[PDB]
Write an enzyme that holds these catalytic residues in place. Structure first.
Site, PDB file in Angstrom:
ATOM      1  N   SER A  43     -40.402 -29.021  13.419  1.00 58.29           N
ATOM      2  CA  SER A  43     -40.727 -27.605  13.396  1.00 58.29           C
ATOM      3  C   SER A  43     -42.294 -27.462  14.343  1.00 58.29           C
ATOM      4  N   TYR A  57     -36.034  -5.907  27.880  1.00 60.97           N
ATOM      5  CA  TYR A  57     -37.168  -6.307  28.516  1.00 60.97           C
ATOM      6  C   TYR A  57     -37.639  -5.631  29.351  1.00 60.97           C
ATOM      7  N   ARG A 109     -32.634 -37.406  37.989  1.00 63.49           N
ATOM      8  CA  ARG A 109     -33.392 -37.045  36.764  1.00 63.49           C
ATOM      9  C   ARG A 109     -32.362 -36.800  35.639  1.00 63.49           C
ATOM     10  N   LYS A 133     -22.443 -28.709  35.445  1.00 57.54           N
ATOM     11  CA  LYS A 133     -21.591 -27.335  35.290  1.00 57.54           C
ATOM     12  C   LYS A 133     -20.424 -27.859  34.845  1.00 57.54           C
ATOM     13  N   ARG A 147     -38.363  -1.447  27.842  1.00 56.93           N
ATOM     14  CA  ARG A 147     -39.572  -1.459  27.228  1.00 56.93           C
ATOM     15  C   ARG A 147     -40.694  -0.972  28.087  1.00 56.93           C
ATOM     16  N   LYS A 182     -32.535 -25.039  40.463  1.00 57.82           N
ATOM     17  CA  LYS A 182     -33.054 -24.372  39.576  1.00 57.82           C
ATOM     18  C   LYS A 182     -34.127 -25.123  38.872  1.00 57.82           C
ATOM     19  N   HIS A 236     -35.945 -19.700  18.843  1.00 60.83           N
ATOM     20  CA  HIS A 236     -36.249 -18.244  19.001  1.00 60.83           C
ATOM     21  C   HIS A 236     -35.863 -17.739  20.194  1.00 60.83           C
TER      22      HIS A 236
HETATM   23  N1  NAI Z   1     -25.934 -16.031  29.741  1.00 62.42           N
HETATM   24  C1  NAI Z   1     -26.546 -17.079  30.201  1.00 62.42           C
HETATM   25  O1  NAI Z   1     -27.081 -18.043  29.308  1.00 62.42           O
HETATM   26  C2  NAI Z   1     -26.724 -17.272  31.466  1.00 62.42           C
HETATM   27  C3  NAI Z   1     -26.124 -16.752  32.688  1.00 62.42           C
HETATM   28  N2  NAI Z   1     -26.386 -16.946  33.689  1.00 62.42           N
HETATM   29  C4  NAI Z   1     -25.488 -16.147  34.799  1.00 62.42           C
HETATM   30  O2  NAI Z   1     -25.522 -14.651  34.413  1.00 62.42           O
HETATM   31  C5  NAI Z   1     -24.382 -14.053  34.597  1.00 62.42           C
HETATM   32  C6  NAI Z   1     -23.839 -13.274  33.420  1.00 62.42           C
HETATM   33  O3  NAI Z   1     -24.373 -13.504  32.186  1.00 62.42           O
HETATM   34  P1  NAI Z   1     -23.294 -13.949  31.287  1.00 62.42           P
HETATM   35  O4  NAI Z   1     -23.885 -14.790  29.923  1.00 62.42           O
HETATM   36  O5  NAI Z   1     -22.266 -15.047  31.770  1.00 62.42           O
HETATM   37  O6  NAI Z   1     -22.537 -12.766  30.697  1.00 62.42           O
HETATM   38  P2  NAI Z   1     -21.282 -12.600  29.710  1.00 62.42           P
HETATM   39  O7  NAI Z   1     -20.789 -14.173  29.352  1.00 62.42           O
HETATM   40  O8  NAI Z   1     -21.460 -11.564  28.676  1.00 62.42           O
HETATM   41  O9  NAI Z   1     -20.083 -11.986  30.634  1.00 62.42           O
HETATM   42  C7  NAI Z   1     -20.721 -10.919  31.594  1.00 62.42           C
HETATM   43  C8  NAI Z   1     -20.004  -9.521  31.534  1.00 62.42           C
HETATM   44  O10 NAI Z   1     -20.214  -9.068  32.856  1.00 62.42           O
HETATM   45  C9  NAI Z   1     -18.725  -8.685  32.951  1.00 62.42           C
HETATM   46  N3  NAI Z   1     -18.035  -8.938  34.350  1.00 62.42           N
HETATM   47  C10 NAI Z   1     -17.641  -9.945  34.765  1.00 62.42           C
HETATM   48  N4  NAI Z   1     -17.263 -10.199  35.905  1.00 62.42           N
HETATM   49  C11 NAI Z   1     -17.248  -8.864  36.409  1.00 62.42           C
HETATM   50  C12 NAI Z   1     -16.821  -8.193  37.654  1.00 62.42           C
HETATM   51  N5  NAI Z   1     -16.164  -8.870  38.616  1.00 62.42           N
HETATM   52  N6  NAI Z   1     -17.263  -6.922  37.880  1.00 62.42           N
HETATM   53  C13 NAI Z   1     -17.741  -6.303  36.878  1.00 62.42           C
HETATM   54  N7  NAI Z   1     -17.999  -6.660  35.649  1.00 62.42           N
HETATM   55  C14 NAI Z   1     -18.035  -8.012  35.177  1.00 62.42           C
HETATM   56  C15 NAI Z   1     -17.958  -9.108  31.791  1.00 62.42           C
HETATM   57  O11 NAI Z   1     -17.329  -7.859  31.271  1.00 62.42           O
HETATM   58  C16 NAI Z   1     -18.723  -9.670  30.812  1.00 62.42           C
HETATM   59  O12 NAI Z   1     -18.849  -8.931  29.639  1.00 62.42           O
HETATM   60  C17 NAI Z   1     -23.333 -15.238  34.862  1.00 62.42           C
HETATM   61  O13 NAI Z   1     -22.436 -15.063  35.856  1.00 62.42           O
HETATM   62  C18 NAI Z   1     -24.072 -16.641  34.701  1.00 62.42           C
HETATM   63  O14 NAI Z   1     -23.820 -17.371  36.153  1.00 62.42           O
HETATM   64  C19 NAI Z   1     -26.950 -17.868  34.123  1.00 62.42           C
HETATM   65  C20 NAI Z   1     -27.769 -18.741  33.363  1.00 62.42           C
HETATM   66  C21 NAI Z   1     -27.812 -18.536  31.798  1.00 62.42           C
HETATM   67  N1  NAI Z   2     -27.785 -31.517  12.325  1.00 57.71           N
HETATM   68  C1  NAI Z   2     -29.044 -31.990  12.799  1.00 57.71           C
HETATM   69  O1  NAI Z   2     -29.350 -33.005  13.004  1.00 57.71           O
HETATM   70  C2  NAI Z   2     -29.861 -30.853  12.474  1.00 57.71           C
HETATM   71  C3  NAI Z   2     -31.248 -31.081  12.953  1.00 57.71           C
HETATM   72  N2  NAI Z   2     -32.195 -30.412  13.403  1.00 57.71           N
HETATM   73  C4  NAI Z   2     -33.611 -30.640  13.252  1.00 57.71           C
HETATM   74  O2  NAI Z   2     -34.270 -30.292  12.274  1.00 57.71           O
HETATM   75  C5  NAI Z   2     -35.398 -29.577  12.557  1.00 57.71           C
HETATM   76  C6  NAI Z   2     -35.574 -28.029  11.834  1.00 57.71           C
HETATM   77  O3  NAI Z   2     -36.691 -27.654  12.394  1.00 57.71           O
HETATM   78  P1  NAI Z   2     -37.066 -26.019  12.473  1.00 57.71           P
HETATM   79  O4  NAI Z   2     -35.375 -25.544  12.119  1.00 57.71           O
HETATM   80  O5  NAI Z   2     -37.213 -25.540  13.715  1.00 57.71           O
HETATM   81  O6  NAI Z   2     -37.739 -25.533  11.409  1.00 57.71           O
HETATM   82  P2  NAI Z   2     -37.859 -24.058  10.818  1.00 57.71           P
HETATM   83  O7  NAI Z   2     -38.954 -23.710   9.763  1.00 57.71           O
HETATM   84  O8  NAI Z   2     -37.647 -23.044  12.306  1.00 57.71           O
HETATM   85  O9  NAI Z   2     -36.331 -23.748  10.073  1.00 57.71           O
HETATM   86  C7  NAI Z   2     -35.550 -23.001  10.591  1.00 57.71           C
HETATM   87  C8  NAI Z   2     -34.450 -22.695   9.195  1.00 57.71           C
HETATM   88  O10 NAI Z   2     -34.106 -23.885   8.718  1.00 57.71           O
HETATM   89  C9  NAI Z   2     -33.962 -24.075   7.443  1.00 57.71           C
HETATM   90  N3  NAI Z   2     -34.083 -25.346   6.729  1.00 57.71           N
HETATM   91  C10 NAI Z   2     -35.107 -26.048   6.936  1.00 57.71           C
HETATM   92  N4  NAI Z   2     -35.083 -27.178   6.348  1.00 57.71           N
HETATM   93  C11 NAI Z   2     -33.856 -27.192   5.846  1.00 57.71           C
HETATM   94  C12 NAI Z   2     -33.049 -28.282   4.909  1.00 57.71           C
HETATM   95  N5  NAI Z   2     -33.588 -29.353   4.812  1.00 57.71           N
HETATM   96  N6  NAI Z   2     -31.667 -27.943   4.617  1.00 57.71           N
HETATM   97  C13 NAI Z   2     -31.528 -26.536   4.870  1.00 57.71           C
HETATM   98  N7  NAI Z   2     -32.039 -25.737   5.787  1.00 57.71           N
HETATM   99  C14 NAI Z   2     -33.193 -26.160   6.026  1.00 57.71           C
HETATM  100  C15 NAI Z   2     -35.006 -23.067   6.829  1.00 57.71           C
HETATM  101  O11 NAI Z   2     -34.660 -22.339   5.717  1.00 57.71           O
HETATM  102  C16 NAI Z   2     -35.283 -22.081   8.231  1.00 57.71           C
HETATM  103  O12 NAI Z   2     -34.346 -20.814   7.573  1.00 57.71           O
HETATM  104  C17 NAI Z   2     -35.322 -29.204  14.109  1.00 57.71           C
HETATM  105  O13 NAI Z   2     -36.386 -29.946  14.669  1.00 57.71           O
HETATM  106  C18 NAI Z   2     -34.167 -30.124  14.642  1.00 57.71           C
HETATM  107  O14 NAI Z   2     -34.876 -30.967  15.453  1.00 57.71           O
HETATM  108  C19 NAI Z   2     -31.841 -28.966  13.041  1.00 57.71           C
HETATM  109  C20 NAI Z   2     -30.623 -28.504  13.076  1.00 57.71           C
HETATM  110  C21 NAI Z   2     -29.367 -29.408  12.824  1.00 57.71           C
HETATM  111  N1  GTP Z   3     -29.034  -8.306  20.431  1.00 55.46           N
HETATM  112  C1  GTP Z   3     -30.193  -8.067  19.936  1.00 55.46           C
HETATM  113  N2  GTP Z   3     -31.414  -9.131  19.901  1.00 55.46           N
HETATM  114  C2  GTP Z   3     -32.474  -8.805  19.831  1.00 55.46           C
HETATM  115  C3  GTP Z   3     -32.912  -7.391  19.507  1.00 55.46           C
HETATM  116  N3  GTP Z   3     -34.166  -7.451  18.990  1.00 55.46           N
HETATM  117  C4  GTP Z   3     -34.517  -8.816  19.016  1.00 55.46           C
HETATM  118  N4  GTP Z   3     -33.438  -9.505  19.387  1.00 55.46           N
HETATM  119  C5  GTP Z   3     -33.751 -11.117  19.538  1.00 55.46           C
HETATM  120  O1  GTP Z   3     -34.089 -11.437  18.413  1.00 55.46           O
HETATM  121  C6  GTP Z   3     -35.334 -12.283  18.174  1.00 55.46           C
HETATM  122  C7  GTP Z   3     -36.087 -11.745  17.263  1.00 55.46           C
HETATM  123  O2  GTP Z   3     -36.870 -10.654  17.541  1.00 55.46           O
HETATM  124  P1  GTP Z   3     -38.136 -10.411  17.001  1.00 55.46           P
HETATM  125  O3  GTP Z   3     -38.357 -10.592  15.588  1.00 55.46           O
HETATM  126  O4  GTP Z   3     -38.679  -9.193  17.187  1.00 55.46           O
HETATM  127  O5  GTP Z   3     -39.090 -11.510  17.829  1.00 55.46           O
HETATM  128  P2  GTP Z   3     -39.512 -11.263  19.224  1.00 55.46           P
HETATM  129  O6  GTP Z   3     -39.378 -12.501  20.059  1.00 55.46           O
HETATM  130  O7  GTP Z   3     -41.118 -10.604  19.234  1.00 55.46           O
HETATM  131  O8  GTP Z   3     -38.717 -10.132  19.806  1.00 55.46           O
HETATM  132  P3  GTP Z   3     -38.686  -9.794  21.242  1.00 55.46           P
HETATM  133  O9  GTP Z   3     -40.488  -9.343  21.719  1.00 55.46           O
HETATM  134  O10 GTP Z   3     -38.139  -8.248  21.413  1.00 55.46           O
HETATM  135  O11 GTP Z   3     -38.364 -10.653  22.247  1.00 55.46           O
HETATM  136  C8  GTP Z   3     -35.733 -11.878  19.492  1.00 55.46           C
HETATM  137  O12 GTP Z   3     -36.588 -12.875  20.135  1.00 55.46           O
HETATM  138  C9  GTP Z   3     -34.837 -11.472  20.617  1.00 55.46           C
HETATM  139  O13 GTP Z   3     -34.443 -12.508  21.287  1.00 55.46           O
HETATM  140  C10 GTP Z   3     -32.003  -6.391  19.375  1.00 55.46           C
HETATM  141  O14 GTP Z   3     -32.301  -5.315  19.335  1.00 55.46           O
HETATM  142  N5  GTP Z   3     -30.623  -6.533  19.944  1.00 55.46           N
END
Ligand code: NAI
Ligand code: NAI
Ligand code: GTP
Ligand code: NAI
Ligand code: NAI
Ligand code: NAI
Ligand code: NAI
Ligand code: GTP
Ligand code: GTP
Lengths: 497, 497, 497
Positions: A389, A258, A82, A122, A261, A110, A205
C-alpha cells in the site's frame, strides 16, 4: 465521410510524419548523406505505423439454454518498443480487426503523449453484453483470457488488459482471477496482469473516475490558457460557460461531475436512445439514479427529450464520449460550439478537422484527454507490482519527522526572540495537517494524474508554437508522439536484421 | 476441555460469523432477495473456514549413525485470496495436520487484522530438535524444502516460510539457500522465498525482537486506553504494574525486555522444566546468559523455584507465550490476574473465555498481539523484493533538502527581522538531527510496526463498541478479520464455477 | 466465378454437413429429443467451420542496401481437436488472411481423410522470393519464426511448419535451426519443430517426391477401379492413356516422373510464362535440366510453345498443380478431358464442379491426392521424435531370425523327406532377399504412403456408395472428414463452458 478507422488514424500519423521528417533528420546523429538519412527516417516511420501482432479467435461457448455459439475475438499489439502493452477490452457487435488495429495504435501514442511506459494494445469481442446472462459473460470472459494467455497475449510482461466500452470492474476481476489461477500461478506478479480491478482485488482509488479527471484536467489546462482563448474568443474559467455530453457512460458520467462541480453547467446528455436537453443544468447525481432505476436517461422529469443530435446542440464545450466517427463531414457544418473536447477515441473524422480549423474552433486531441485513464491504470499496474500500500511504510515516520521540522524552527526561534520566554507556536495549517503523514494512495493519484496531464499539455503547446500549427493541437500531439517513439527505434538498433 | 485445535479456531470463527452475518447482508450490493443474500453469505463463510491445501510428506533421512528414518512433515495453505501465503515452520513432536490446519487459519486472520497482504500457511515437522545433530537438522530442513518446492509450496509467489517454535535464523538460512540454488535459480526473487533470514542473508533489523515489540505495542495500545482500564479497575501505565511470562523463548524473552524497560516488573518466568518466581523483578539480560550457560532458567540464583504453574501466579498481566491450550477450563478458575495478553497462538480454550469474561478480566486476542512478527516479516519479504537497502537512494539528498528548508526559513526571516543583521540560527534539534538523512532501515521497522499495530487496535476498539462486545476483543477481532476476507471473495467472482 | 477462397471451402463443408447431418444424429448416443439432437449437431458444425486462431504479423527487415521494409505474415490454426497442427509456409505476393484461413481449413480435413494426427494450419508471407537476396530470405525466415515462437505458433506441441509454394528444404532448415537455438533449446524435441528438413538435418527419404507419390497412388487407386472407369468410359491402366501438368514445380515435377515411369505419356506442361505442348511425351529428366539451366520450361527444343492454357488441352488426365481457382466457370466448358486430378489446393471453383458432374467427368478431391505429402511429413515428425533411425535396432536381428525360419523349415523337411539325405535348399527369393534385414527408413515410406492412401481411397468409395454421390468424390471426402472430426468434439465434452 466514413473512412476505414485504421486508414483514418494512419491519416493523422501521416500529417505528423510530414512535419517531423525535417526536424528529425537533423537530430539523427549517424554519419550518412542527407538523402540517405531521409531514406532512414521514412523507413522507420513505415515500421511504426502498422500493428506488430493481430490475433484473432473463435470461442465455442455453451449458453444457458445448452446451445453452442462461436465468438470472434480480437487483440492487437501495435508496437513492442515498450513492454508491456496496455489496452482495453471492448464488447460490441461493431468491433472488427480494422477497428482494433487502430484503437491499438492510438494507445501507442496516448502512452507516448503522457510518457507512460506501455506499448499500445486493444482487444475486442463481437458480442452484445445486453443480451447474455451474467453467467454467460463469465464463461466468455474467462475463455477469452484462457485463449490469449496460452498464446502470449496476457501477462504482466506482455499485455495488460483494461476496462473499456461495455466492460467494467466486474469483467476485469474475472480476468485477473482466471490468469492468476491457471497460467501465472507461480509468478509473483500474477494479479498484476490487468488494471481496472476492484479495490479489494488490487485496484486504485478512483480508477472509475480516472478518465473523467483526464477530460477535466485537460480542458482546464487549455481553458486557463489565454493564448488560445483570445483566439477562440471566450473567457478563461468554467462557471462562465457550459458544456454537453455524448454517451452518459463512464467517461461521459464522470466528465460531468468533475466539470459540474466547478460551475460549468452541463446543458444536455444523450445516448443510443435519445437526448435530454436542459439549458439550465442537469444534476449528475440525480440522473445517475435513473440509469440504475429507469434504464435510460430518458424520462428524466427535470428536462425534456430533444429532437436532435447532441453534436448540433448550442453550447460552449462539446464532449463526444460515446463512439467513433460521430462528428463527420455532415455534422461539422452544424456544430455551433467553440471547443470540442474528446472523451471517445477518434470521434472526429479527418475531413471534419479542416472544417473545424476553418470554422476557427479548437479541437483537443483524444490522445491528450482520455489519456488520464491510462496514467491511472499505470499507477495500478505499478501499485500491485510493488505489493505494498503506497506510503504505508512511512506514515508514522513522516508524521514524526515533520513534527520535528516545525519543532526545530520553534526551538530555534525561542532562542533568538525567546528572551521573553514567549512560546512560539509553530503548528501546521489546515491544509498541511492533511499532508503530514505523507502521500497516501489517493493523494498520488489525484496528483500524478494532474501532473502527468500538466507536462503533456505543455509539450503540446510547446510544439504547436515551434511549428505554427495554430489550433490543430491534434497534429501537434502526434508530433510529440512520433518524436518519442522514433528515438526508441532509432537507438535500439531496430532489429537483429 | 481439550478440543481439536482446528475445531477450536473454527469455534471462534463461528461466533464471528454469528454477528457479522447481519451487518454483512446490508453491505452486499447485489440484487437478490433478503433470504437469498443470506444464502449467499453463509455459503461464502463455508468457503473461508476450511483449508484449501494440506500437503503431507515423509522423508527418508540418513542419521549420522547411518540408520534411516522417516519424518512426517505437513504444510497447510489456508486461503488463497491473497498471495503469497506466509507461515512459520514449527519443529515439535506434537505437531499434526489437525494442529497445522488451525495455525494456518489463524495467520489468514492475523494478516487480515493487521492489513498485511498474505494468505495463511503453516508447516510442521514431527521432530525434536534437541535430539538431532546440527548436521542432521540441515539434511532435514533442506530435504523438507526440496519436497515442498517441487510441489509448489515454497516460492515468493506461493508461500513464504518463517521462523516459529524451535526454529530460528539458522534454519531459515538453510531454506533460502536450498531454494535459491535448486528451483528458483534464474528467478530474480529467489532469496525472497523465506523471511526471518539472517541480516547478512537479507534479513531486517530486529526480526528476532519483532514479535516482542508486537506484544509490547499491543499491550500499550490498551493499557493506555482508560475506557477499559476503568472497567478492569487498573491504572494506565507500566511502571505501576507487573507481569509474568510463560515460555522464556523468543517471544517470552523479548516480550520481557521491551516490557521490562518501561518499569513493568517481570515477576516470574517458566518453561518445560519449572518456574522462576521473584516478586521483585528478573533482569532479562542476566537470565538470558543462563540460557546460554546453564541450559535452563532454573538455578537462577536471584530467584527461587516455584511449586506451581505460572498461569496461577498473582500478577497484573499474564502472558502465555509457550504453547497452545495452556489456559483451560481447569486453569481459568485460578488465574488471579487482570489482563491476559497472548504471545502464543490460541493459548486459551474457548471454554475459558466465558470464565474470563465472567471473572471480568480482559483477554487480548493473539490475532492482534503476535501479529507484530508478521508485519516485520512482511517488511523483510518486501525489503529483498526491491533489491535495495531501503532509504539508501536518498540519504545524501534528504540531508541536503532539509538543510535548505531550515536555511530558507532562516534567509526568509533575516529579511523581515534582519534589519539588525542578526544571524537567525535555524538549526535542527537533537531528535530531528537523527531523522535528517531520512528513513533508515531500522526506522521504518520501529515505525511500520508501531503504526500497523496502531490502526489495528483502533479497528478492534471501533468494532467492539459498534457491536457491544465489551471485553471480548477476540470476537471483535474476528469480526474485522471476517469482514475483510469476505469483501475479497464477494467481489472476486469467487470461482470460475 | 471468383469466390472468397474461404467462402469457397466453407461452401464445400456446407454440402458436406447437409448430408451428414441426418446419419450423424442417429449415431449421437446422448438422451435428448430428436430436434434437440439436431440443435446439437448444427451447433458443433458451427464450431468446426471457423479458424480458432489467425495471427498476423509485421516484420522490420534490413535489405542488403540498408533500407527497411515491413513484411506482413500470417498463420492460422484451424482446429485444435488434434495437436500439433501442421501446415506449410507459402511465400507469395498473393497470400492473405482470407486465403490462409481456408488453406488452414483444408489441412484439418486432409489430415482427417488420411487419418493423420494433426490439426490444420497454414502460414503465409506477402513476399516474392524471386526478388530478394538469398541472405534476405534468411533474415526473413528466421525473423518469421522468432515472432511465431514467442507467441506459441511453432513447436512440436503446437505447430509444425512444412514446405509449400516457393519454399523448399532450404527454408525449412533455417526454421529448425532458429527454433532449436533460441526457444526450445532445452527441449529434447527441438529439431522436430518442422518437417521437410534436409536429410542431414533430420529429413526423410523422398520428402520431396512425397507429394508426387500421393498424386500417383491416388490416381492409381481410382484408374484401377472399373466401377468408375465403366462410367467415365476409359480403361484401367496408365500406358494406355496420357495426362498433362499445370505448374511444373515440386508437385507437378514429381507427379510426372512417378506417372511417367508407368507408360502414361505426359503431353504438356506450363507455368507462369507459357505452355510446352508435345502430344508424344516429355522426358521429365531432360526438362528438369532446363529449370536448372534455362530458367523456364520454355525453349525446350523437343516441344513447342502452345498458344493456350493447359486446362483446355486435349488429354486424358488433367492435373492442375500450380495455384488456386484455376479451373472456373469460364474454363469448365472447355476442359476436353476425362479425369481431373488435383495436386494444387482447391484448384476448382464450386461452380465448375456441377459442370464437371454434368459433363460426366470425375474430379478427384485435393483432400485425397496431395494428402500424400502430409502422410510423409508425419513420418518425419515421427522419425525425429523417436531419435532413432527407424529399423536400426533390429537389422542384424531380423536378418538372423529369418535365416532361422527358412532353416527350421529346411531342417524339418530333411527329417520327413530326408530319408535320402537330400539337402533341401530353402533360400530366399530375389524380392525377399531385400526385405530380410527388416523395414529400412525408405521402405516404410514407400509403404506407409501407399497404404495410407489405400485405406483412404476405400473410405471414400465406401461413402460415395452409401450416400449415392456418383462421381462427386469430393463431397464423399468431406463426409468422411466431417464424421471424424465430429466424434472428437462430440465426446470431448467440447469445452469447459
Ligand atoms: N471508460 C473508460 O475507462 C475509457 C473510455 N474511453 C473511451 O470513452 C468512450 C466511452 O466510455 P465508456 O466507458 O466506453 O462508456 P460505456 O462503456 O459506459 O458506454 C458508453 C455509453 O455511450 C452510449 N453510446 C454508445 N454508442 C453510442 C452512439 N453511437 N450514440 C449515442 N450513444 C452511444 C451507450 O449507451 C453507452 O452507455 C469509449 O468509446 C472509449 O473509447 C477511453 C479510455 C478509457
Ligand atoms: N490476489 C492478489 O494477489 C492480490 C494482491 N494484492 C496486493 O496486496 C496489496 C494490498 O494493498 P492495498 O489493498 O492497497 O492496501 P489497502 O490498505 O488499500 O487495503 C485495501 C483493502 O484491502 C483489505 N485488506 C488488506 N489486507 C488484507 C488481507 N490480508 N486480507 C484481506 N483483506 C485485506 C483492507 O481491509 C482494505 O479494506 C496491493 O499492493 C496488491 O499488490 C491486492 C489484491 C489482490
Ligand atoms: N459513481 C459515483 N462515484 C463516486 C461518487 N462520488 C465519488 N465517487 C468515486 O468514489 C471515490 C471515492 O470518493 P471520495 O471518498 O469522495 O474520494 P475523492 O477521490 O476525494 O472523491 P472525488 O474528489 O469526487 O474524486 C472517488 O474517487 C470517485 O472516483 C458518486 O457520487 N458517484
Ligand atoms: N518466535 C516467533 O517468531 C513467533 C512465535 N509465535 C508464537 O510464540 C510462541 C513461542 O515463541 P517461540 O519463538 O516459538 O518460542 P521458542 O521457539 O523459543 O520456544 C518456546 C519456549 O517455551 C518453552 N515451552 C514450550 N512448551 C511449553 C509448555 N507446554 N510449558 C512450558 N514451557 C514450554 C520451551 O522450553 C521453549 O524454550 C509459539 O507458540 C508461537 O506460536 C508466533 C509468531 C511468531
Ligand atoms: N543471496 C541473495 O540474493 C541476497 C540478496 N540480498 C539483497 O541485497 C540487498 C542488500 O541490502 P542490505 O543488506 O539491506 O544493505 P545493508 O547496508 O543493510 O547491508 C547489510 C550488510 O551487507 C553487507 N554487504 C553489502 N553489500 C555487499 C556485497 N556486495 N557483498 C558482501 N556483503 C555486502 C554490508 O557490509 C552490510 O554489513 C537486500 O535488499 C537484499 O534484497 C540480500 C541478501 C542475500
Ligand atoms: N510442394 C509441396 O510440398 C506441396 C504442395 N502442395 C500444393 O501443390 C501446389 C504446387 O506445388 P509447389 O510445391 O507449391 O510448387 P512450387 O513451389 O515449385 O511452385 C509451383 C510452380 O507453378 C508455377 N505457377 C504458379 N502459379 C501459377 C499460375 N497461376 N499459372 C501457371 N503457373 C503457375 C510457378 O512457376 C511455380 O514454379 C501448391 O499450390 C500447393 O498448394 C500441397 C501440399 C504439399
Ligand atoms: N539437430 C538435431 O537435433 C538433429 C537430430 N536428428 C536425429 O538424429 C537421428 C538420425 O537418424 P538418421 O539420420 O535417420 O540415421 P541415418 O542412418 O539416416 O543417418 C543419415 C545421415 O546422418 C549421418 N550421421 C549419422 N550420425 C551422425 C553423427 N553423429 N554426426 C554427424 N552425422 C551423422 C550419417 O552419416 C548419414 O549420412 C534422427 O532420428 C533424428 O531424430 C537428426 C538431425 C538433426
Ligand atoms: N538477544 C538480545 N538481542 C538484543 C539485545 N539488544 C538488542 N538486541 C536486538 O538487536 C538489535 C540491535 O539492537 P540496537 O543496536 O540497540 O538497535 P535497536 O533496535 O534500537 O535496539 P532496541 O531498541 O532494544 O530494539 C535490536 O533491534 C534488538 O532486536 C540483547 O540484549 N539481547
Ligand atoms: N529431382 C529428382 N529427384 C530424384 C530423382 N531420382 C530420385 N529422386 C529422389 O531422390 C530419392 C532417391 O532416389 P532413389 O535412390 O532411386 O530411391 P527411391 O525412393 O527408390 O527412388 P524412387 O523410386 O524413384 O522414388 C528418391 O526417393 C526421389 O525422391 C531425379 O531424377 N530427380
Amino acid at each position: 465521410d466514413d473512412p476505414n478507422f485504421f486508414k483514418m488514424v494512419e491519416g493523422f500519423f501521416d500529417r505528423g510524419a510530414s512535419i517531423v521528417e525535417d526536424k528529425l533528420v537533423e537530430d539523427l546523429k549517424t554519419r550518412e548523406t542527407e538523402e540517405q538519412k531521409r531514406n532512414r527516417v521514412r523507413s522507420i516511420l513505415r515500421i511504426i505505423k502498422p500493428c506488430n501482432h493481430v490475433l484473432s479467435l473463435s470461442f465455442p461457448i455453451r449458453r444457458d439454454d445448452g446451445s453452442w455459439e462461436v465468438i470472434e475475438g480480437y487483440r492487437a499489439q501495435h508496437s513492442q518498443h515498450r513492454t508491456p502493452c496496455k489496452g482495453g477490452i471492448r464488447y460490441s457487435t461493431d468491433v472488427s480487426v480494422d477497428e482494433v488495429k487502430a484503437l491499438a495504435s492510438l494507445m501507442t501514442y496516448k502512452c507516448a503523449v503522457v510518457d507512460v511506459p506501455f506499448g499500445g494494445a486493444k482487444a475486442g469481442v463481437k458480442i452484445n453484453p445486453k443480451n447474455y446472462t451474467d453467467n454467460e459473460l463469465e464463461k466468455i470472459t474467462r475463455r477469452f483470457t484462457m485463449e490469449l494467455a496460452k498464446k502470449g497475449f496476457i501477462g504482466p510482461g506482455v499485455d495488460v488488459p483494461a476496462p473499456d466500452m461495455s466492460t467494467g470492474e466486474r469483467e476485469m476481476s474475472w480476468i485477473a482471477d482466471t490468469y492468476a489461477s491457471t497460467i501465472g500461478h507461480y509468478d509473483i506478479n500474477a494479479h498484476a496482469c490487468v488494471t481496472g480491478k476492484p479495490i479489494s482485488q488490487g485496484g486504485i482509488h478512483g480508477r472509475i473516475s480516472a478518465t473523467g479527471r483526464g477530460v477535466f484536467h485537460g480542458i482546464e489546462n487549455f481553458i486557463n490558457e489565454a493564448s488560445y482563448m483570445s483566439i477562440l474568443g471566450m473567457t478563461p474559467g468554467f462557471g462562465d460557460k457550459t458544456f454537453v455530453v455524448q454517451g452518459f457512460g463512464n467517461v461521459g458520467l464522470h466528465s460531468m461531475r468533475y466539470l459540474h462541480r466547478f460551475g460549468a453547467k452541463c446543458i444536455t446528455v444523450g445516448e443510443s436512445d435519445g437526448s435530454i436537453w436542459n439549458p439550465d443544468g442537469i444534476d449528475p447525481k440525480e440522473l445517475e439514479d435513473f440509469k440504475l432505476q429507469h434504464g435510460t436517461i430518458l424520462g428524466f422529469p427535470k428536462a425534456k427529450i430533444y429532437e436532435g443530435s447532441i453534436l448540433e446542440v448550442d453550447c460552449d464545450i462539446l464532449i463526444p464520449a460515446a463512439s467513433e466517427k460521430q462528428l463527420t463531414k455532415s455534422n461539422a457544418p452544424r456544430v455551433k460550439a467553440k471547443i470540442i473536447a474528446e472523451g471517445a477515441n477518434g470521434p472526429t473524422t479527418p475531413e471534419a478537422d479542416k472544417i473545424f480549423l476553418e470554422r476557427n474552433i479548437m479541437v483537443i486531441p483524444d490522445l491528450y484527454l482520455n489519456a488520464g485513464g491510462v496514467t491511472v491504470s499505470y499507477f495500478e499496474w505499478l501499485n500491485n507490482l510493488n505489493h505494498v500500500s503506497y506510503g504505508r511504510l512511512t506514515f508514522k515516520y513522516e508524521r514524526d519527522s515533520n513534527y520535528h521540522l516545525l519543532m526545530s524552527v520553534q526551538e530555534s526561534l525561542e532562542r533568538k526572540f525567546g528572551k521573553h520566554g514567549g512560546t512560539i507556536p509553530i503548528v501546521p495549517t489546515a491544509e498541511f495537517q492533511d499532508r503530514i503523514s505523507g502521500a497516501s494512495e489517493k493523494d498520488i493519484v489525484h496528483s500524478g494524474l494532474a501532473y502527468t496531464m500538466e507536462r503533456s499539455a505543455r509539450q503540446i503547446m510547446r510544439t504547436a508554437m515551434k511549428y505554427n500549427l495554430g489550433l490543430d493541437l491534434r497534429t501537434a500531439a502526434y508530433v510529440n508522439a512520433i518524436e518519442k517513439v522514433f528515438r526508441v527505434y532509432n537507438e535500439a538498433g531496430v532489429t537483429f536484421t
